[PDB]
Amino acid sequence: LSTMYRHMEKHNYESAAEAIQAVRDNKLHAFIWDSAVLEFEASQKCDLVT
Amino acid sequence: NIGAVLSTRKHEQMFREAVNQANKRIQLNATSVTHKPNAIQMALSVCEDLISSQVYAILVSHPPTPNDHFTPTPVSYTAGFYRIPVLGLTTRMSIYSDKSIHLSFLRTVPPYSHQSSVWFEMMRVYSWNHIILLVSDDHEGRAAQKRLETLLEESKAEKVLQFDPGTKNVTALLMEAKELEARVIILSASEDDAATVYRAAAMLNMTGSGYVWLVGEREISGNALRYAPDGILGLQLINGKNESAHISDAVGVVAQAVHELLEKENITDPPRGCVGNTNIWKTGPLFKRVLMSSKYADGVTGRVEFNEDGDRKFANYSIMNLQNRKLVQVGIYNGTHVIPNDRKIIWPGGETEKPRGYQMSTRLK
Amino acid sequence: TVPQCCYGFCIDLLIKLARTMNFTYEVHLVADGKFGTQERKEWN
Amino acid sequence: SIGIAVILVSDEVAIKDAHEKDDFHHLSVVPRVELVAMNETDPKSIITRICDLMSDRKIQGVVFADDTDQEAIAQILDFISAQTLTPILGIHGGSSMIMADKDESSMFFQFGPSIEQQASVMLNIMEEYDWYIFSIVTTYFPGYQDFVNKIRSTIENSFVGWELEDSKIQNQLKKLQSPIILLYCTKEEATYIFEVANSVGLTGYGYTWIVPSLVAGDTDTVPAEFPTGLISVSYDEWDYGLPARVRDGIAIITTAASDMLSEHSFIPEPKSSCYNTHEKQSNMLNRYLINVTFEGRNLSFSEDGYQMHPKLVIILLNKERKWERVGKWKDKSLQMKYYVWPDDHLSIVTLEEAPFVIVESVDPLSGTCMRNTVPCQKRIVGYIKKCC
Amino acid sequence: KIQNQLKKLQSPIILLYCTKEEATYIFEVANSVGGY
Numbered sequence: 001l002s003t004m005y006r007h008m009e010k011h012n013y014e015s016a017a018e019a020i021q022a023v024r025d026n027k028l029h030a031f032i033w034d035s036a037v038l039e040f041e042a043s044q045k046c047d048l049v050t
Numbered sequence: 051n052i053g054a055v056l057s058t059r060k061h062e063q064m065f066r067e068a069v070n071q072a073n074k075r076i077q078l079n080a081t082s083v084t085h086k087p088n089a090i091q092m093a094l095s096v097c098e099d100l101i102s103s104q105v106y107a108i109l110v111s112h113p114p115t116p117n118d119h120f121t122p123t124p125v126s127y128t129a130g131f132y133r134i135p136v137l138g139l140t141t142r143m144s145i146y147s148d149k150s151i152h153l154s155f156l157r158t159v160p161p162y163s164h165q166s167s168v169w170f171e172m173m174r175v176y177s178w179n180h181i182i183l184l185v186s187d188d189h190e191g192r193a194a195q196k197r198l199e200t201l202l203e204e205s206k207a208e209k210v211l212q213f214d215p216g217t218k219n220v221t222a223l224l225m226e227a228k229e230l231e232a233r234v235i236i237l238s239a240s241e242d243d244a245a246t247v248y249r250a251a252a253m254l255n256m257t258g259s260g261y262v263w264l265v266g267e268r269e270i271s272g273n274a275l276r277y278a279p280d281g282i283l284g285l286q287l288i289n290g291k292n293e294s295a296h297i298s299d300a301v302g303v304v305a306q307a308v309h310e311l312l313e314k315e316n317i318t319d320p321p322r323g324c325v326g327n328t329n330i331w332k333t334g335p336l337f338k339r340v341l342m343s344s345k346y347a348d349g350v351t352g353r354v355e356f357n358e359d360g361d362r363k364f365a366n367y368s369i370m371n372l373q374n375r376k377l378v379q380v381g382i383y384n385g386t387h388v389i390p391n392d393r394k395i396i397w398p399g400g401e402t403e404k405p406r407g408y409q410m411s412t413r414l415k
Numbered sequence: 416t417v418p419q420c421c422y423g424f425c426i427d428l429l430i431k432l433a434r435t436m437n438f439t440y441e442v443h444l445v446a447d448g449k450f451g452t453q454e455r456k457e458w459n
Numbered sequence: 460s461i462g463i464a465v466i467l468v469s470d471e472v473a474i475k476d477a478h479e480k481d482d483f484h485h486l487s488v489v490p491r492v493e494l495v496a497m498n499e500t501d502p503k504s505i506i507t508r509i510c511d512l513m514s515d516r517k518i519q520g521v522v523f524a525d526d527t528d529q530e531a532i533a534q535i536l537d538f539i540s541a542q543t544l545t546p547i548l549g550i551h552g553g554s555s556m557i558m559a560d561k562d563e564s565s566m567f568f569q570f571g572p573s574i575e576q577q578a579s580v581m582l583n584i585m586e587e588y589d590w591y592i593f594s595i596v597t598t599y600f601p602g603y604q605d606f607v608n609k610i611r612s613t614i615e616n617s618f619v620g621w622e623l624e625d626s627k628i629q630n631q632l633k634k635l636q637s638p639i640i641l642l643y644c645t646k647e648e649a650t651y652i653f654e655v656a657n658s659v660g661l662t663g664y665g666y667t668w669i670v671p672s673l674v675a676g677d678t679d680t681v682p683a684e685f686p687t688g689l690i691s692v693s694y695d696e697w698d699y700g701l702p703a704r705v706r707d708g709i710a711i712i713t714t715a716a717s718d719m720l721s722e723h724s725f726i727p728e729p730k731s732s733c734y735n736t737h738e739k740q741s742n743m744l745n746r747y748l749i750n751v752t753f754e755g756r757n758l759s760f761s762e763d764g765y766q767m768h769p770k771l772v773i774i775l776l777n778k779e780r781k782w783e784r785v786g787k788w789k790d791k792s793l794q795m796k797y798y799v800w801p802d803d804h805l806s807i808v809t810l811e812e813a814p815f816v817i818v819e820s821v822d823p824l825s826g827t828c829m830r831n832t833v834p835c836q837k838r839i840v841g842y843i844k845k846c847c
Numbered sequence: 848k849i850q851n852q853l854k855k856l857q858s859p860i861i862l863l864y865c866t867k868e869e870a871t872y873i874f875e876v877a878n879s880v881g882g883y
């Protein structure tokens with residue numbers, strides 16, 4: 001996964017809330033590696049699918 | 051093999067007696083003895099004496115100056131510039147062994163960077179846990195802290211490792227130690243720094259309140275004891291107090307090394323004049339290796355075993371406890387083992403039993 | 416550093432653990448907000 | 460102002476002319492002109508020359524140069540600072556080399572890179588070669604802990620991960636057999652180390668050793684048994700001339716003195732020409748001499764004795780007792796004319812052909828590529844290799 | 848030559864069959880080089 005990390009690192013977010021806000025406005029393709037908050041965003045907000 | 055070098059008249063007489071004893075039992079040739087009180091002057095004086103002696107044999111002791119920091123440094127640099135191994139008597143300084151800049155600056159007395167094995171053995175015997183170490187900002191303190199950390203790797207604890215340059219107003223280290231709630235601490239620094247640390251601890255009303263620790267041999271002095279409280283388990287050298295005994299062992303070791311090297315046919319001739327020393331000595335590494343391999347079965351300092359870096363593995367230290375402003379030698383640890391039960395150790399708080407290191411720790415963030 | 420309210424699953428679990436173990440705790444947040452990493456030998 | 464002098468142990472007669480031709484528009488007081496010539500390698504001669512220079516005029520800093528390989532003389536020069544509380548400059552030879560852990564209260568300046576700088580240069584070279592060490596082997600030397608610490612710091616800071624992994628040494632070499640080997644030992648120990656490596660087999664065309672300055676200080680009389688392929692890092696072995704270095708040092712000293720005079724309004728002077736003349740006000744000038752700019756280039760340095768823009772060179776030892784002088788380190792930049800170094804050599808022509816070769820960009824962060832790609836020597840319309 | 852070949856093939860199992868006088872040198876070289 002080295003080629004999938006260095007080449008796609010400048011688009012990372014420092015906080016989960018910022019990533020959620022960005023993805024709610026269709027400004028982000030997808031967000032992963034956050035199952036702790038993804039098990040709640042897809043349920044309470046019911047606006048995105050996992 | 052060359053003329054003896056000593057600071058005082060008594061030291062010169064002791065060196066002459068040691069040379070005579072070595073010659074009585076491969077002959078040592080001496081012509082004159084000289085020394086200087088100024089380090090800058092002594093740097094040229096030692097070179098002139100070595101040139102005039104027409105031999106490579108230098109062995110001096112530490113000056114009686116209170117600082118004892120850079121007075122023998124130019125002499126050590128001059129000795130290590132050539133391939134001339136030297137032996138130091140009653141020179142317990144960790145700065146030389148911290149970087150090993152010199153070629154063969156080896157001292158019979160272990161430097162301040164050593165004796166961490168004694169601390170580890172004492173901690174293992176007393177089952178001490180959750181201890182911290184404070185090291186001075188100097189190179190010797192950093193080397194001692196690194197050695198202690200290396201020897202404590204099975205773990206140890208979260209040591210503060212404060213720099214502590216030696217400022218008059220220093221309370222951050224004491225506050226951190228109080229916050230960490232460590233009963234046993236290990237502090238090693240200069241006499242002034244140790245006195246400042248003891249004064250800060252006394253002002254914090256925590257020196258003798260359920261806190262029992264130990265101190266090294268670097269702070270063992272009359273001035274430090276005048277302000278330090280009781281219940282301190284310091285360390286002292288087995289025979290490093292007097293330099294009149296190590297001279298005989300050094301002379302015997304030098305004679306043994308000379309006898310061993312006499313078999314080799316690659317002995318070089320030192321230059322007659324210091325100026326005419328363009329050639330570089332090439333047999334020095336062999337002589338240093340022979341000296342390191344060679345050892346003395348007994349003597350004034352007992353069995354001597356050079357380590358990898360060239361330090362004698364005597365592993366002997368007397369533990370002195372402080373009580374009623376008096377130092378009592380409760381046994382001594384030899385070979386990094388348990389010390390004899392000459393006297394009962396009394397904690398500064400007033401409890402005969404050793405308090406637990408990890409005590410009074412309930413609140414956590 | 417205004418004191419905010421900390422509640423939820425993790426807070427309830429921590430409170431239950433402290434009550435079971437009779438421990439005293441002072442929960443606080445992190446100014447940086449990072450989950451922890453090893454940046455340039457020391458964990459930042 | 461400054462009674463600096465140049466000692467040559469070689470003529471360097473143009474150093475005085477270059478110093479005189481230097482302007483003093485930004486210099487408050489014109490420096491004194493003094494030159495000391497001596498041919499000796501003894502502390503007594505150096506002490507006598509220093510005393511004579513101090514008696515003649517106020518030195519407040521001297522420049523020492525030598526032709527021998529004895530770097531320990533530079534260490535003695537540091538002690539000279541302890542005897543004078545004045546900066547000491549090096550030009551070439553022993554004074555050029557920088558001692559290990561020589562930082563102290565006394566000020567000393569050297570033109571040679573420190574252990575950390577050498578480790579950084581070696582790491583950059585290995586990154587250019589796209590190889591990894593994956594083997595830790597260090598002999599008992601004074602400059603051992605510092606090198607290991609610098610290597611660990613470099614591999615931790617670097618984004619790309621680094622692999623970590625006479626009978627005893629041979630067994631250790633066999634167990635840690637890696638194409639990249641880092642060693643640091645004296646020449647006497649290196650004589651046996653080379654034989655052990657040849658016996659094991661790492662000295663062949665299967666592994667390369669890196670000895671920047673431990674042994675290969677001057678690879679003009681390299682042993683025949685020394686394996687070919689190893690490289691070393693030097694400090695302007697045949698790039699910067701002695702008169703140029705002397706002129707640069709004089710300019711740096713003058714600029715530092717001007718800065719100290721501006722920031723203190725009192726130029727320090729030696730008390731006398733005695734050994735204990737200054738035994739009785741020295742850190743003020745040292746705190747400003749570190750930030751020194753001269754000849755249109757900042758020469759800022761730390762207490763370790765490094766260079767802001769060192770002129771490091773790389774020498775590649777060959778089988779014919781020859782070393783390549785190609786290599787520059789201007790502005791802390793990595794560049795060389797032998798980046799692609801080794802009927803085992805073949806050339807393969809590769810096109811794009813869409814999904815088969817989709818990588819067409821090279822990362823500009825350090826000039827290297829990923830760990831799962833290859834260099835691609837594209838056409839000039841020279842040898843600018845991209846990632847394939 | 849023999850030492851390089853022995854070190855290159857660091858297999859846990861090594862087979863050899865030759866005269867004892869010649870095998871002694873090979874065994875000494877293998878021991879010097881160095882589980883198996």
Ligand SMILES: *[C@@H]1O[C@H](CO)[C@@H](O)[C@H](O)[C@H]1NC(C)=O
Binds near residue numbers: 219220221222
């Ligand atoms: C410095 O000021 C006083 C003087 O000793 C002392 O009480 C105080 O704790 C010190 N504070 C710090 C931050 O060192």
Ligand SMILES: *[C@@H]1O[C@H](CO)[C@@H](O)[C@H](O)[C@H]1NC(C)=O
Binds near residue numbers: 750
């Ligand atoms: C050196 O000093 C100049 C001005 O005196 C300043 O502009 C520059 O930033 C300084 N450099 C360093 C490294 O302090």
